[PDB]
């Protein structure tokens, strides 16, 4: 896996669970087109997004219906959706780890790369 | 001011100063129309991006140039920038803060909303 | 205002009002000597807890009951509290803003800091 | 692994290697007495702390010198050490993940409580 996402709940201090996302690559024309999408899992984690043949360097955007995740838990949330945008490095180490910590008025987000 | 973004810098730990941010509205179309833009001052922070009037409800997004920031100062960040999207002003007008703290290769996020 | 302290509450996107904080010194035989306390008020802000002349050269430390915050609200924490520790002042006089952002599971920390 | 502690670098995007942290509980008289150190590996991360025998009910402070981090890496930092303090509960689930993102004057934490 080339390309992982972690996201956590402030809240209730537990992994983020069924939190929908949908990726994206900047075309040439720069619009977004879907290029991935998954929901995170029980530990709140989201693999096998896609492949380091498919995974070729450009401009990407993670994109978490955060919205979505604190309206089905009844609360209000403050933003529309959480996006992360970053450009995928070959010659750089290229195991991209990406982590969002989520509150209602507030959400963090990291990245880790490693080899 | 109905809407103002403030920046730090968690690496020097002091405002982020000379970030240059771009505030758009999501049209009946769907698309993301210009709303206004500009850049932090010496504490960090932008003031008088728009006005109670023209500042309707709405979808907006805040996408701060995070990046070039970076640049200036020796840093290759992780982020192209860093993007705010929010429904503003849908029960009443308020006012909005936003909170911006940057490190190269994360930055957290931050809504104060207060009912003027 | 040679020291300040601002909270945020990331669950209600406002200021975090009545939080209370007791800030410690570092005596010679490495106990913390008590140095001042106080409660941030409607804006979730803290000010005047010192001086310039009684604010020396030493390591101190910010603890923020975030705690008692928590439980007014119906609301059982993970944190007793946040503590912060930093050396002031070891080259000269500087200006130390704390920010705190609070979430029951999670809370941030960042310093700005000026020469005045 | 009742108590799991992993540490980040926001500077870099990796884990923070080579962290040494201290755990503490607070005696009946209030003073913080040693139950547990270690250093993080390689993923920045630091197991077998305690034993679900030895961590009983009651209030902990993990102690991260973050300080002596920054310092090795030529970078100065603002905090004398990074301390997490929390009561340990028994009803409710007990399995605490504690995670640390380090800027030089910044650091974030958050508790993951799962079953």
């Given at each position: 896996?080339?390309?992982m996402v972690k996201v956590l709940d402030a809240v209730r201090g537990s992994p983020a669970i069924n939190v929908a996302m949908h990726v994206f690559r900047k075309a040439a024309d720069d619009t977004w087109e879907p290029f991935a999408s998954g929901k995170t899992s029980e530990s709140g984690e989201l693999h096998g997004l896609t492949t380091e043949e498919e995974f070729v360097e450009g401009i990407y955007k993670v994109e978490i219906d955060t919205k979505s995740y604190w309206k089905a838990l009844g609360i209000?949330?403050?933003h529309e959706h959480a996006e992360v945008v970053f450009?995928?490095?070959d010659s750089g180490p290229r195991r991209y780890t990406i982590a969002a910590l989520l509150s209602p008025y507030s959400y963090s987000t990291t990245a880790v790369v490693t080899n």
């Open positions: 896996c080339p390309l209000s949330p403050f450009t995928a490095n």
